[PDB]
Structure 1
């Protein structure tokens, strides 16, 4: 059991202290990064897998796990403001919390739980800090590889799975062939669903499933076939990716600042290229505060409201936090 990645003895204690909140929505991943010598994804993933006895269940060597995770973390760009390993850490930890919501208790197999957390870990790996549309419009190598379709998301999967090809890093070595086959299918499905161009349709289908839901007597959702299970899993990882506004205001505000740095930097590159400036990426005109109000009203609230419906009453405190945070950014807009 590794307990630090740095030279600071005070950090072993501070890290173990922060990790007492592993199973909680209120964990502070920024502090985890500070106390792990900037290894939030390696350390959180290590903590999650031990908490769930996944290294034991799936006969994954601690040594191989750490080596794979360090290397995956190293393929996130630390010079990208938002889509770096802290984001991946956050989404994996958020997914670990959502998997334990009481409504889904006993629903998922171990393989499925494993797929979901691994999918969260890999889901933005090697992100270059610009959008699919910027890659397509600049005729980039990635858009030429992937034929303009879910360019980044296909890339994130490719990198994640390609890193398992070296024996020293193959954390899934002791799964069976069929297990590996099913996990791959599941992870591909979940990561491709994080493409925002698919959100409107994913929400429609999720609403449509909330409508016909069958909460069994003991309070647990009945999700009887693979199709229903993978559909909840894809929406869970999506919610987790879109969870920043549902966290304490102190955390949300730092997340907002990072995504706007990244977005504004894309705006600048576009200007440098004489391209049309994407309006939300334009630092000279766009309002951070309106963008968040807009993003919640149009995208985050409708999704979480629908998730809450599904897991009722598990998600009520998230919903209220969101509404508070929304109200907080509105009140920062100087006009009406």
Structure 2
């Protein structure tokens, strides 16, 4: 409505507020945002994607995200897709990516947690879920979100890539698989270490813009971009970040409840009788988020300085919340 258009003014901005846009779109954040993103970047015009076909695909996809799961619902995909959309425009990455790589990264963000059940890879493996057997324990969740998302492009009324070259559907299907698999947290370190090596040997043009050789380097930056977008809640305005903290702790504690119901051992950050929400967020910033964004900032400097500042600041709020 009228509040929707006022909010979508901030589309291309880190301050954008995803809750507000969920409330104004009949609980369809992901469809509203993805649709605004394509228009903005002119993707439908570029890849002859019909608008009907696009809405039908998104709506279906949004509706495969479970709405009774506290954190991994359509809101989070919408968030990660909007965050990625901004990082893609960061000044240090200007004119570096092809249209196809841009469409790949945002699409990756959109389908990247689809059909998530609200339990970890570790849980699903220890309970012998169908999914763990299906996937032999390797990026269980991630391989699944990728299969669902690419299955839904089977219908004609949903094949939004129907007007790419064969070579383009392949080059894309490859980039997406690579980016979603990289959001599996057990790959975090390898990715961070790989990022640090890329910064070490960074090269720019005379105008402070990165020089990325060919495929290998371009997709490593995209890998890392969607992984920062996935771990961007603490770089967002305090009000937004605490609402994200509440939802993730909700989801985590429902998992701790199911673990206990079943005599299994409870993972301490999922234990609702001993885990401080506050200590845990500080830890999450000190050992995972800051190390990553610090490295990202070095790569696109000084574009992410504001982001680093917001982060240290949000850090100290949570620190000051602990006795």
TM-score relative to the length of structure 1 = 0.96
Matched, 1:242 2:237: no
Matched, 1:267 2:245: no
SS of corresponding position for 1:200: helix
After superposition, give the CA deviation of every residue in 1:15-37 in whole Å (9 maximum; x if it has no partner).
01100100000000000000001
Tell me, in whole angstroms, the C-alpha distance in 2 between the residues paired with 1:224 and 1:59.
29
Tell me, in whole angstroms, the C-alpha distance in 2 between the residues paired with 1:64 and 1:70.
10
After superposition, give the CA deviation of every residue in 1:253-292 in whole Å (9 maximum; x if it has no partner).
0000000000000000000010000110000010000110
Residue 312 of structure 1: how far off its partner (Å): 0.2
Residue 105 of structure 1: how far off its partner (Å): 0.3
After superposition, give the CA deviation of every residue in 1:173-219 in whole Å (9 maximum; x if it has no partner).
10110000000000000000000000000000000000000021111
Q: Which stretches of structure 1, 4 residues or longer, exceed 6 Å deviation after superposition? A: none
Matched, 1:35 2:27: no
Residue 224 of structure 1: how far off its partner (Å): 1.9
After superposition, give the CA deviation of every residue in 1:46-103 in whole Å (9 maximum; x if it has no partner).
0000000000000000000000000000000000000000000000000000000000
After superposition, give the CA deviation of every residue in 1:305-334 in whole Å (9 maximum; x if it has no partner).
000000000000000000000000000001
Across the two proteins, how many residue pairs are aligned to each other? 323
SS of corresponding position for 2:114: coil
Alignment partner of 1:133 out of 118, 122, 135 = 122
SS of corresponding position for 2:284: helix
Name 2:3's counterpart in structure 1: 14
SS of corresponding position for 2:255: helix
SS of corresponding position for 1:82: coil
Aligned ranges for residues 124-163 of structure 1 at < 5 Å?
Answer: 124-163=113-152
Alignment partner of 1:104 out of 93, 106, 116 = 93
Residue 242 of structure 1: how far off its partner (Å): 0.2
Tell me, in whole angstroms, the C-alpha distance in 2 between the residues paired with 1:14 and 1:68.
25
Name 2:187's counterpart in structure 1: 198
What's the Cα RMSD here?
0.4
Tell me, in whole angstroms, the C-alpha distance in 1 between the residues paired with 2:187 and 2:17.
29
Tell me, in whole angstroms, the C-alpha distance in 2 between the residues paired with 1:96 and 1:225.
22
Tell me, in whole angstroms, the C-alpha distance in 2 between the residues paired with 1:158 and 1:256.
28
Tell me, in whole angstroms, the C-alpha distance in 2 between the residues paired with 1:309 and 1:80.
35
